[PDB]
Amino acid sequence: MAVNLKTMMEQVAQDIDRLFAEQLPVPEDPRRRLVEAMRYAAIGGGKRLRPLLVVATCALFNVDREAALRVGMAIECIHVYSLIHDDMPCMDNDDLRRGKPTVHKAFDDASAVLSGDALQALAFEILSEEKIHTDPHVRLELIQALAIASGKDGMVGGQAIDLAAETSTVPFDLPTITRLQQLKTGALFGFCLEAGAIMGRQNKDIRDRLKAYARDIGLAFQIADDLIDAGKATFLSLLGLEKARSQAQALVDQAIAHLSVFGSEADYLRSIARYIVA
Amino acid sequence: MAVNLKTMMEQVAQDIDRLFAEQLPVPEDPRRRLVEAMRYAAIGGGKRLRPLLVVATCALFNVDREAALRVGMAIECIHVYSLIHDDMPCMDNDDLRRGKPTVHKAFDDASAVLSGDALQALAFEILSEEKIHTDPHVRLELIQALAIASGKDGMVGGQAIDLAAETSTVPFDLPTITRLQQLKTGALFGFCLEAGAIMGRQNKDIRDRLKAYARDIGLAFQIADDLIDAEGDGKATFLSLLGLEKARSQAQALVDQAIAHLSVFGSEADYLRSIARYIV
Lengths: 278, 280
Ligand SMILES: [Ca+2]
Fold this sequence. Notes:
The structure is a homodimer.
Chain A (H helix, E strand, L loop, with lengths): L1 H22 L8 H11 L6 H10 L6 H23 L15 H4 L2 H20 L7 H15 L4 H12 L7 H11 L1 H14 L4 H25 L6 H5 L1 H18 L8 H11 L1
Organism (chain A): Zymomonas mobilis subsp. mobilis (strain ATCC 31821 / ZM4 / CP4)
GO molecular function, one term (chain A): metal ion binding
Protein name (chain A): Polyprenyl synthetase
């Protein structure tokens, strides 16, 4: 099961890379720097957790594979742009990323701002195209979901809470850092899973179960990260080492449990929760 | 015509303020600052030129007025976020915009980055809702058009060309600054006019006439801007390249050209006609 996953992963990574290169031809005009920055940030980089989730979820319902990949690129556009902006000096001020210089270092601050801005627009351009799905109602569902997942009630909202924690001398509580995770990383994860239910025209019960999986692995992910990282409150600082470890493991079990109404079609999502999140 | 135009402008301004206020409730969780930054930028502008164009174009056909206004809010999301990101120290460093301190000044740099980021997302959320149009294809057409108009092949692409001009010692030529305008400001104007055609379920011939109007007023607007800014005093501009007399006459000709695209409409197009003349 870990081998079928490790190879799904590689197929996904090379496909997303292909899609981005194809989506981002370098224009023969002064937009050259902008698009080269977009390609620099979007191509080659991450392990494509988000496109992977989209592909693995769409596989529950035998969704058109190609369209599933493009939805993957759309969510990855949002993820990548968020990283470009997060890395900037006024934010996390990071010099490196994938062992490679961040956009504002390789290019400049303004190029980082604009390349991120363009990638957000591109996510919606991609989702909007007819190749995604013939049912227009479907495409609208994906677009509304992504817009909510990306903005003030989603990823950016989470970024903002994180910024508030860093600039406040009042330590946050467990409910607030939980809400922080739900928005900062959980919104995009939730989109990945929900996109599958949408692409498959599934019912509320199935939609709810997939979003619960996303909810639970997202939290497990952050708890694990709060452990790996070792002044603001964290799951480690609030739960302590022992309970944080046990709660991360419990969340993984829970995430898998949400998929229990599925047969073996849900096996990729099971593996993702273990051999990646755990 | 200018009298009704002023009235429409004041009305659109009030409506857009109402709509943004309703769209942006302030949470008591730590997202408070983000949303207050969004409200600060979006509310109490602001001539709302882009909402005005949407409203005046939808008026050509039988489009629900509140729906037209919401599309106006959506395009204004893109415009406002673009100003927030443009004012930042990384870009133009403006501490002020029409007597109003910029977001990074009233708040901080990080809040300006995020409030702009959230506003771009908000534009697409707004367009996706059924409130806009019962027909799903109308909404999808608007969304596709906005994403193209906003990104690397639109507004941000234009922003990039401008940034390239400012950080190079090689003066751009007429073709390049023409492309610069088409993208930097022309793309959003194009959306405003095309949105009216889309909301009105209009044919390709009508859509093209409207986009041609946007193209012409957008160029005229930039030429007039190149003129205005010069009156109040080294990258190439329409003024530097064309010279004073040619830039003046071309701005004027472009207004006439913009209006001529509307010759197939009756008095319902008077707002758009006035707006074009106003852009001078
Ligand atoms: Ca600028």
